[PDB]
RNA sequence: ACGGAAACCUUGAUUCUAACGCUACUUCUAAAUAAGCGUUA
């Protein structure tokens, strides 16, 4: 989608993708204190990055 | 027709017994298989 053309143009690039609304679990391990603050702040940093 | 003749420096003996080329040590450290879609129509 181009902001200049103001329309969406399709391209020959087809991918195998996970469908929307799929639940996938990850485990994250932290061995120090600073990284613990970083990972406990993964939300509100994701929000700041998205803002 | 010689201070000469005859006479083994010889027999039996394991350079042998015991003794770990052993003790400790992460092939380890960061890293989205990902980015760009212009211009014409």
The technique by which this structure was obtained is cryo-EM
Nearest to A28, CA basis, from A44, A17, A41, A47: A41
CB-side neighbour CA atoms (13 Å) of A10: 2
CA–CA separation, A46 and A29 (whole Å): 18
Q: Say how far apart CA A45 and CA A35 lie, in whole Å.
A: 13
Letter string b/e over residues A17-34, b meaning 16 or more CB atoms within 10 A of that residue's CB: eeeeeeeeeeeeeeeeee
Q: How far is the CA of A50 from the C1' of B24 (A)?
A: 51
Place of tokens 């469908």: A19
**Strand B within 7 A of A9 CB:** yes
Nucleotide in closest CA–C1' contact with A12:
B37
Look up tokens 């993708």; give the residue: A17
Shortest CA to C1' contact from A15: nucleotide: B33
Q: Which residues contact A48 (CB under 8 A, 6 or more apart)?
A: none
Q: Largest alpha-carbon pair distance within chain A? A: 49
Tokens of A16: 């195998």
Resolution of this deposited model, Å: 2.7
Closest CA to A36 of A26, A44, A28: A28
């Amino acid at each position: 989608y181009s902001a200049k053309t103001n329309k969406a143009k399709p391209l020959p690039l087809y991918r195998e993708s996970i469908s929307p609304l799929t639940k996938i679990e990850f485990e994250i391990t932290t061995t120090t204190d600073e990284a613990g603050r970083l990972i406990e702040e993964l939300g509100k940093r994701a929000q700041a990055f998205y803002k």
